[PDB]
Amino acid sequence: VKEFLAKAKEDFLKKWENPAQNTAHLDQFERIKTLGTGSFGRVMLVKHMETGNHYAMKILDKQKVVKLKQIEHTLNEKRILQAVNFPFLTKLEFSFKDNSNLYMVMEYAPGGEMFSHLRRIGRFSEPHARFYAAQIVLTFEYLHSLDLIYRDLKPENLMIDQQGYIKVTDFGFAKRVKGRTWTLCGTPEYLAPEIILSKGYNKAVDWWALGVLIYEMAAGYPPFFADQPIQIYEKIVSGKVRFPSHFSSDLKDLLRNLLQVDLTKRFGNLKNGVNDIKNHKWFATTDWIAIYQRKVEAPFIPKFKGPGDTSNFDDYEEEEIRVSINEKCGKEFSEF
């Protein structure tokens, strides 16, 4: 582990200090279907003509990025993603830009988001939940060793691959920071109390977010919900969670130590780091190496019906990808 991580760090640092840039062009891809939309961009399924490989191409409108003050965040996303390498991280295959947009071409997961299956099915059994959570525990161990904070764990950001393993996507808030940082970002249901109370925080907020995820996966709803974000923040800051009667003793005790407002006691944050989590009784069945190796049998495997089938995704209205004859925001995105 220590050894693996040391070498992992050497690999990351080389790409971090000398990022890949301009490794494809838009006309190399055929655009098939919108798989998701956001405030400053969309993601489309595309075909790479030269390989016939299918990819999820994230397209960001530079002007809208600038309007929403997401320049540095967007540079973080690309710079971090091109540098990392881990089985449960979606891979950035190509990045480029044109007059109008930024593009990140990432590995496609036709299985859809965890969110979709969780909502439909209602909830995951503890072993099912535990299987996903293990991959998150390992992924954060990896990311955190590189000085990266992820900052948006949720089911909407976890793709199910063709082996039923997960890919973490959406690095828009990921940041390489050795000290404390202060940006209010995340998703309301998943925010640590530190963030809400506008303190400087650190990687411990990812461990709290893990607690929220495990809970939601196993309960079928989040530990803190209301109709409005303000009502959610109140709940989170009160320091009170009710667990379903069906939750096992071990699960509840893991969640008490993750959803811990007190940082000196929150698991993942302590003197014994991630092993506090890994050696907990709830995980006692988990073979961590077999999970990393993808040798554990997945409790659910997505229904396959083609390398570019989109049936696990919802339908979104299509829009032209327009490229201006004028370069927008060249300077802001010079390093992209």
Binding site: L68, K154, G172, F173, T183, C185, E189, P222, A226, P244
Partner: peptide, 20 residues
């Protein structure tokens, strides 16, 4: 039930990221 309250809530769909 808590499940009933959740499903009746306005936050069972995809949740947007927030930022300052």
């Amino acid at each position: 039930t808590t499940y009933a309250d959740f499903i009746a809530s306005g936050r069972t769909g995809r949740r947007n990221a927030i930022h300052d």
